[PDB]
Design a protein around this motif. Structure first.
Motif, PDB file in Angstrom:
ATOM      1  N   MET A 143       1.054  -1.052   0.070  1.00 46.34           N
ATOM      2  CA  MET A 143      -0.036  -0.055  -0.087  1.00 46.34           C
ATOM      3  C   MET A 143       0.823   1.424   0.176  1.00 46.34           C
ATOM      4  O   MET A 143       2.160   1.283   0.340  1.00 46.34           O
ATOM      5  N   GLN A 144       0.196   2.399  -0.341  1.00 48.72           N
ATOM      6  CA  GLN A 144       0.927   3.784  -0.319  1.00 48.72           C
ATOM      7  C   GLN A 144       0.714   4.446   0.769  1.00 48.72           C
ATOM      8  O   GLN A 144      -0.688   4.774   1.104  1.00 48.72           O
ATOM      9  N   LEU A 145       1.643   5.020   1.466  1.00 48.18           N
ATOM     10  CA  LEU A 145       1.425   6.064   2.468  1.00 48.18           C
ATOM     11  C   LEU A 145       1.808   7.355   2.340  1.00 48.18           C
ATOM     12  O   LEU A 145       2.911   7.501   1.670  1.00 48.18           O
ATOM     13  N   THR A 146       0.982   8.417   2.953  1.00 52.31           N
ATOM     14  CA  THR A 146       1.581   9.886   2.729  1.00 52.31           C
ATOM     15  C   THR A 146       2.158  10.076   4.001  1.00 52.31           C
ATOM     16  O   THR A 146       1.539  10.020   5.136  1.00 52.31           O
ATOM     17  N   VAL A 147       3.620  10.320   3.907  1.00 57.02           N
ATOM     18  CA  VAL A 147       4.105  10.752   5.261  1.00 57.02           C
ATOM     19  C   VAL A 147       4.948  12.054   4.959  1.00 57.02           C
ATOM     20  O   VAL A 147       5.756  12.081   3.969  1.00 57.02           O
ATOM     21  N   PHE A 148       4.614  13.148   5.562  1.00 57.47           N
ATOM     22  CA  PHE A 148       5.427  14.216   5.399  1.00 57.47           C
ATOM     23  C   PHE A 148       5.352  14.891   3.867  1.00 57.47           C
ATOM     24  O   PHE A 148       6.633  15.109   3.607  1.00 57.47           O
ATOM     25  N   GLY A 149       4.279  14.921   3.404  1.00 61.33           N
ATOM     26  CA  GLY A 149       4.287  15.169   1.875  1.00 61.33           C
ATOM     27  C   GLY A 149       5.049  14.399   1.059  1.00 61.33           C
ATOM     28  O   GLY A 149       5.763  14.781   0.056  1.00 61.33           O
ATOM     29  N   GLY A 150       5.283  13.210   1.416  1.00 65.39           N
ATOM     30  CA  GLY A 150       5.921  12.444   0.579  1.00 65.39           C
ATOM     31  C   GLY A 150       4.967  10.751   0.698  1.00 65.39           C
ATOM     32  O   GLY A 150       4.141  10.843   1.000  1.00 65.39           O
ATOM     33  N   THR A 151       5.763   9.819   0.011  1.00 68.96           N
ATOM     34  CA  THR A 151       5.199   8.691  -0.078  1.00 68.96           C
ATOM     35  C   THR A 151       6.087   7.556   0.650  1.00 68.96           C
ATOM     36  O   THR A 151       7.452   7.229   0.166  1.00 68.96           O
ATOM     37  N   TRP A 178       8.737  -1.293   5.286  1.00 67.95           N
ATOM     38  CA  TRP A 178       8.560  -0.020   4.803  1.00 67.95           C
ATOM     39  C   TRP A 178       9.663   0.311   3.960  1.00 67.95           C
ATOM     40  O   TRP A 178      10.780   0.262   4.234  1.00 67.95           O
ATOM     41  N   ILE A 179       9.420   0.409   2.530  1.00 65.90           N
ATOM     42  CA  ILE A 179      10.416   0.959   1.671  1.00 65.90           C
ATOM     43  C   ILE A 179      10.002   2.535   1.287  1.00 65.90           C
ATOM     44  O   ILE A 179       8.972   2.760   1.122  1.00 65.90           O
ATOM     45  N   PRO A 180      11.027   3.221   0.977  1.00 65.86           N
ATOM     46  CA  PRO A 180      11.060   4.497   0.169  1.00 65.86           C
ATOM     47  C   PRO A 180      10.479   4.662  -0.624  1.00 65.86           C
ATOM     48  O   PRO A 180      10.511   3.573  -1.493  1.00 65.86           O
ATOM     49  N   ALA A 181       9.450   5.987  -1.192  1.00 67.97           N
ATOM     50  CA  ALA A 181       9.200   6.137  -2.666  1.00 67.97           C
ATOM     51  C   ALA A 181      10.013   7.009  -3.037  1.00 67.97           C
ATOM     52  O   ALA A 181      10.155   8.158  -2.497  1.00 67.97           O
ATOM     53  N   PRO A 182      10.398   7.033  -4.336  1.00 73.71           N
ATOM     54  CA  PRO A 182      10.502   5.809  -5.243  1.00 73.71           C
ATOM     55  C   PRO A 182      11.598   4.704  -4.646  1.00 73.71           C
ATOM     56  O   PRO A 182      12.218   4.952  -3.844  1.00 73.71           O
ATOM     57  N   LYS A 183      11.015   3.292  -4.976  1.00 74.34           N
ATOM     58  CA  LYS A 183      11.800   2.257  -4.784  1.00 74.34           C
ATOM     59  C   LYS A 183      13.189   2.446  -4.633  1.00 74.34           C
ATOM     60  O   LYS A 183      13.798   2.996  -5.666  1.00 74.34           O
ATOM     61  N   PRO A 184      13.834   2.566  -3.500  1.00 75.86           N
ATOM     62  CA  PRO A 184      15.390   2.960  -3.515  1.00 75.86           C
ATOM     63  C   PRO A 184      16.473   1.948  -4.259  1.00 75.86           C
ATOM     64  O   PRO A 184      15.815   0.883  -4.887  1.00 75.86           O
ATOM     65  N   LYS A 185      17.616   2.181  -4.231  1.00 78.57           N
ATOM     66  CA  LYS A 185      18.452   1.186  -5.127  1.00 78.57           C
ATOM     67  C   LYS A 185      19.131   0.255  -4.152  1.00 78.57           C
ATOM     68  O   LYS A 185      18.828  -0.911  -4.751  1.00 78.57           O
ATOM     69  N   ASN A 186      19.935   0.672  -3.322  1.00 77.43           N
ATOM     70  CA  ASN A 186      20.464  -0.514  -2.651  1.00 77.43           C
ATOM     71  C   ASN A 186      20.607   0.112  -0.948  1.00 77.43           C
ATOM     72  O   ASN A 186      21.544   0.302  -0.567  1.00 77.43           O
ATOM     73  N   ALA A 187      19.219   0.364  -0.443  1.00 82.43           N
ATOM     74  CA  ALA A 187      19.038   0.834   0.873  1.00 82.43           C
ATOM     75  C   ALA A 187      19.547   0.130   2.114  1.00 82.43           C
ATOM     76  O   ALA A 187      19.574  -1.386   2.074  1.00 82.43           O
ATOM     77  N   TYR A 208       6.405   1.387  16.857  1.00 75.49           N
ATOM     78  CA  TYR A 208       7.336   0.679  16.317  1.00 75.49           C
ATOM     79  C   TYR A 208       6.925   0.976  14.809  1.00 75.49           C
ATOM     80  O   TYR A 208       7.295   0.040  13.766  1.00 75.49           O
ATOM     81  N   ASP A 209       6.330   2.042  14.298  1.00 73.93           N
ATOM     82  CA  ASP A 209       5.950   2.385  13.191  1.00 73.93           C
ATOM     83  C   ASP A 209       7.119   2.703  12.235  1.00 73.93           C
ATOM     84  O   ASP A 209       7.544   3.805  12.588  1.00 73.93           O
ATOM     85  N   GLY A 210       7.609   1.985  11.383  1.00 75.77           N
ATOM     86  CA  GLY A 210       8.630   2.175  10.503  1.00 75.77           C
ATOM     87  C   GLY A 210       8.413   3.291   9.330  1.00 75.77           C
ATOM     88  O   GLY A 210       9.555   3.571   8.765  1.00 75.77           O
ATOM     89  N   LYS A 211       7.166   3.758   9.252  1.00 76.95           N
ATOM     90  CA  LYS A 211       7.083   4.626   7.962  1.00 76.95           C
ATOM     91  C   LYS A 211       7.963   5.920   7.936  1.00 76.95           C
ATOM     92  O   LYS A 211       8.309   6.588   7.197  1.00 76.95           O
ATOM     93  N   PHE A 212       8.108   6.598   9.449  1.00 74.32           N
ATOM     94  CA  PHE A 212       8.942   7.762   9.428  1.00 74.32           C
ATOM     95  C   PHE A 212      10.341   7.665   9.024  1.00 74.32           C
ATOM     96  O   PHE A 212      10.909   8.407   8.464  1.00 74.32           O
ATOM     97  N   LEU A 213      11.021   6.410   9.606  1.00 72.13           N
ATOM     98  CA  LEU A 213      12.430   6.482   9.075  1.00 72.13           C
ATOM     99  C   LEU A 213      12.579   6.049   7.613  1.00 72.13           C
ATOM    100  O   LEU A 213      13.583   6.511   7.068  1.00 72.13           O
ATOM    101  N   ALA A 214      11.764   5.420   7.150  1.00 72.61           N
ATOM    102  CA  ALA A 214      11.733   5.031   5.788  1.00 72.61           C
ATOM    103  C   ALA A 214      11.688   6.574   4.971  1.00 72.61           C
ATOM    104  O   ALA A 214      12.378   6.817   3.914  1.00 72.61           O
ATOM    105  N   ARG A 215      10.790   7.400   5.349  1.00 70.73           N
ATOM    106  CA  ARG A 215      10.394   8.522   4.737  1.00 70.73           C
ATOM    107  C   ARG A 215      11.857   9.621   4.984  1.00 70.73           C
ATOM    108  O   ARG A 215      12.024  10.118   4.003  1.00 70.73           O
ATOM    109  N   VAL A 216      12.328   9.474   6.034  1.00 69.84           N
ATOM    110  CA  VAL A 216      13.311  10.633   6.371  1.00 69.84           C
ATOM    111  C   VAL A 216      14.502  10.418   6.191  1.00 69.84           C
ATOM    112  O   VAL A 216      15.441  11.133   5.879  1.00 69.84           O
ATOM    113  N   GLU A 217      15.256   9.004   6.082  1.00 74.72           N
ATOM    114  CA  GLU A 217      16.553   8.804   6.070  1.00 74.72           C
ATOM    115  C   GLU A 217      16.698   7.614   4.785  1.00 74.72           C
ATOM    116  O   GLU A 217      17.703   7.241   4.656  1.00 74.72           O
TER     117      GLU A 217
END
Ligand SMILES: *[C@@H]1O[C@H](CO[C@@H]2O[C@@H](C)[C@@H](O)[C@@H](O)[C@@H]2O)[C@@H](O[C@@H]2O[C@H](CO)[C@@H](O)[C@H](O)[C@H]2NC(C)=O)[C@H](O)[C@H]1NC(C)=O
Ligand SMILES: *[C@@H]1O[C@H](CO[C@@H]2O[C@@H](C)[C@@H](O)[C@@H](O)[C@@H]2O)[C@@H](O[C@@H]2O[C@H](CO)[C@@H](O)[C@H](O)[C@H]2NC(C)=O)[C@H](O)[C@H]1NC(C)=O
Ligand SMILES: *[C@@H]1O[C@H](CO[C@@H]2O[C@@H](C)[C@@H](O)[C@@H](O)[C@@H]2O)[C@@H](O[C@@H]2O[C@H](CO)[C@@H](O)[C@H](O)[C@H]2NC(C)=O)[C@H](O)[C@H]1NC(C)=O
Ligand SMILES: CN(C[C@H]1CCN(Cc2ccccc2)C1)S(=O)(=O)c1ccc2ccccc2c1
Ligand SMILES: *[C@@H]1O[C@H](CO[C@@H]2O[C@@H](C)[C@@H](O)[C@@H](O)[C@@H]2O)[C@@H](O)[C@H](O)[C@H]1NC(C)=O
Ligand SMILES: CC(=O)N[C@H]1[C@H]([C@H](O)[C@H](O)CO)O[C@@](O)(C(=O)O)C[C@@H]1O
Ligand SMILES: *[C@@H]1O[C@H](CO)[C@@H](O)[C@H](O)[C@H]1NC(C)=O
Ligand SMILES: *[C@@H]1O[C@H](CO)[C@@H](O)[C@H](O)[C@H]1NC(C)=O
Ligand SMILES: [Cl-]
Ligand SMILES: [Cl-]
Length: 527
Positions: free
Chosen positions: A14-22, A96-105, A126-135
């Motif tokens: 699924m797609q999440l909106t986190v901090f004006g990103g995905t 949780w993967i960043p969008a767009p799909k990262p290369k070698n995260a 334990y929600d990992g969407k912020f870490l995916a989004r920010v880092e």
């Protein structure tokens, strides 16, 4: 529509909106056969491929467990309780993967705590969407079995060999190894992190040979395997497995006929009886936990630690300022979350009996003597604060420090923090301080959401910790380099430097709890 082909089949996220990103979330991906029926108590078995598109669009079942019902309707306790249906069918993980799909995260794998008796990866903190989004890291978390269902042991017996919950975790790390490349993650850059029994778990994965190559680096928050609650004695594990068999009417002479009998009980019968396999429980009783099974763990972990028998890598280790206070309101007399809990000398002594039930009078007298040499005998909070430090220093701070000396002594870089900020939204009373578990929301970057009533200084502190944790995962070095941040020195056994984490000033200090941990780590084990 984002579909990823894993080795066992297609999964939809699924797609999440986190901090004006995905962020793309894959919640509840199975990583094992459900440990059901004849499979109860056995090591987790590998998953058979599926042909459909598995829909990974909601958190999966949490593993069977007893629930903290001590403070009904209180967010301070119930925030730790499972937020999905309990079921024996619970071997699932999240990505949780960043969008767009990262290369070698870089991949972060979270292992939750809970005394090896409780917990679930689906918790809000334990929600990992912020870490995916920010880092731009991939965050992975998994459900692993707990209680008797995850740690029952007739050692040597494969029908109940012990440590299954650790083998659950390990099979999840293995899944990340074979499949995270498909998600855009780097299997060669996997950092394990966890808190309390999670951190004790991460530390045992440093020792287990079968985990050596399933991860790169390790982060231990408020926990390590050498903590007095972490590893069950193979004697007691058998005495406890037997006491449960008697409590459920499953006593047999053929130990295997015992397992068969316990496998026809309903989970609720096994759960209601776990608390009684020990004769003197404490708020910190690990009724069923890690043991020396000869498989995951080949020798007593103290021996392995002392003789350098672990994976050589960097570690990030740390503890909170008031680790012990949480457990005081679970049995200690004169204590409550709903008053300031001023206790007397006699109430303090009674508290030692609650927390050190099998210790001698002399050993209890010796805790009293090293913790009640007051500066000001007339301060009424004296005894209340002494009992919290006793529980925290003995159960968390001193073994975490002793683990970091022992590990670093073999050449590896180690970083130690002392988290001393009390969350502005913390629902427990103020005398409870910087509580066990209340650094986790900061690690996961929850104060980065402005809608969440945290102060701005808290958002700054969380953002900085998130940078430091991600730079440790990526680069082995937990610095913040852009903003003029305090440089975080390596912990050496000589000078024993550590970093304080607070909203005011980040300081470098030396030799934490030095007088207290000399008592705990040298004298007290002799009693
Ligand atoms: C798995 O998901 C597919 C795709 O639907 C998506 O996931 C759902 C959970 C829901 O949120 C949808 O809006 C998503 O687009 C499901 O496909 C649907 O299947 C039903 C019956 O099989 C059909 O009537 C619908 O038209 C299909 N498409 C949509 C858009 O709903 C599929 O059923 C799901 N399978 C399982 C086992 O959960
Ligand atoms: C090993 O187990 C025995 C038996 O445990 C008791 O019975 C179980 C079925 C369960 O209900 C436990 O809670 C019981 O304690 C332990 O023996 C008991 O010891 C306590 C004091 O330590 C004593 O008061 C009980 O009467 C004893 N009961 C019996 C039947 O002997 C024994 O202590 C355990 N060993 C260790 C090291 O804890
Ligand atoms: C602090 O509270 C504890 C807990 O007692 C309960 O909670 C209180 C907030 C209140 O609602 C009481 O009605 C409850 O009994 C107190 O501990 C009790 O103290 C009494 C008398 O000292 C004793 O008879 C009980 O056994 C105690 N109960 C427990 C569970 O320990 C404590 O006295 C309070 N202290 C202060 C300074 O407020
Ligand atoms: C029954 N539990 C303990 C209660 C006390 C804490 N309560 C959750 C909580 C957590 C943080 C702040 C407030 C409340 C639950 S437990 O989770 O099963 C458990 C058992 C043994 C342990 C041994 C060592 C370390 C941790 C242990 C945890
Ligand atoms: C670093 O600080 C930022 C805000 O501070 C301003 O921007 C930085 C980049 C410097 O140029 C400084 O002089 C400014 O005052 C935050 O927006 C940013 O998130 C912070 N980063 C971390 C990792 O904490
Ligand atoms: C949680 C659990 O154990 N089972 C299932 C739940 C509940 O059984 C029902 O919602 C009734 O509560 O529903 C599903 O089937 C569903 O159709 O979304 C998913 C899940 O596997
Ligand atoms: C990912 O990184 C490793 C080095 O850490 C490298 O060997 C590997 O080839 C890279 N793969 C991709 C697909 O980028
Ligand atoms: C216990 O029972 C199982 C199943 O009947 C059997 O395979 C095993 O050999 C038995 N062991 C002993 C010691 O009787
Ligand atoms: Cl006094
Ligand atoms: Cl001493």
């Amino acid at each position: 529509d984002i579909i990823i082909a894993t080795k066992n089949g297609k999964v939809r996220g699924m797609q999440l909106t986190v901090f004006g990103g995905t962020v793309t979330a894959f919640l509840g991906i199975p990583y094992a056969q459900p440990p059901l029926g004849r499979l109860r108590f056995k090591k987790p078995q590998s998953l058979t491929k599926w042909s459909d598109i598995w829909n990974a669009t909601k958190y999966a079942n949490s593993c069977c467990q007893n629930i903290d019902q001590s403070f009904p309707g209180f967010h301070g306790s119930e925030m730790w309780n499972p937020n999905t249906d309990l079921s024996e069918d619970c071997l699932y993980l999240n990505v949780w993967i960043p969008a767009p799909k990262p290369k070698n995260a870089t991949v972060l794998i979270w292992i939750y705590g809970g005394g090896f008796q409780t917990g679930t990866s689906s918790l809000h903190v334990y929600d990992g969407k912020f870490l995916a989004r920010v880092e731009r890291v991939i965050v992975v978390s998994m459900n692993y079995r707990v209680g008797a269902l995850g740690f029952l042991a007739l050692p040597g017996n494969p029908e109940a060999p012990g440590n299954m919950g650790l083998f659950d975790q390990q099979l999840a790390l293995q899944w990340v190894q074979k499949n995270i490349a498909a998600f855009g993650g780097n299997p060669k850059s996997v950092t394990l992190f966890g808190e309390s029994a999670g951190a004790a778990s991460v530390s045992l994965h440093l020792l287990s040979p079968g985990s050596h190559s399933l991860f790169t680096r390790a982060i231990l928050q408020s926990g390590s395997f050498n903590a007095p609650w972490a590893v069950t004695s193979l004697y007691e594990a058998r005495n406890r497995t037997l006491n449960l068999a008697k409590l459920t009417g499953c006593s047999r002479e053929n130990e295997t006929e015992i397992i068969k009998c316990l496998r026809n009980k309903d989970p609720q019968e096994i759960l209601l009886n776990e608390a009684f396999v020990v004769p003197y429980g404490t708020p910190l009783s690990v009724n069923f936990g890690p043991t020396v099974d000869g498989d995951f763990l080949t020798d007593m972990p103290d021996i392995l630690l002392e003789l350098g028998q672990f994976k050589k890598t960097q570690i990030l280790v740390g503890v909170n300022k008031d680790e012990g206070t949480a457990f005081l309101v679970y049995g200690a007399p004169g204590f409550s979350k709903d008053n300031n809990s001023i206790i007397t000398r006699k109430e303090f002594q009674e508290g030692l009996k609650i927390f050190f039930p099998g210790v001698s009078e002399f050993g209890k007298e010796s805790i009293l003597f090293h913790y009640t040499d007051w500066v000001d005998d007339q301060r009424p909070e004296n005894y209340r604060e002494a009992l919290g430090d006793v529980v925290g220093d003995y159960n968390f701070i001193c073994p975490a420090l002793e683990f970091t000396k022992k590990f670093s002594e073999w050449g590896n870089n180690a970083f130690f923090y002392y988290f001393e900020h009390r969350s502005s939204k913390l629902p427990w009373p103020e005398w409870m301080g910087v509580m066990h578990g209340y650094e986790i929301e900061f690690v996961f970057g929850l104060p980065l959401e402005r809608r969440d009533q945290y102060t701005k200084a808290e958002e700054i502190l969380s953002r900085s910790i998130v940078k430091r944790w991600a730079n440790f995962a990526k680069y082995g070095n937990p610095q913040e380099t852009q903003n003029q941040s305090t440089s975080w020195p390596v912990f050496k056994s000589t000078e024993q430097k550590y970093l304080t984490l607070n909203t005011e000033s980040t300081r470098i200090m030396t030799k934490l709890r030095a007088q207290q941990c000399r008592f705990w780590t040298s004298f007290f084990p002799k009693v």
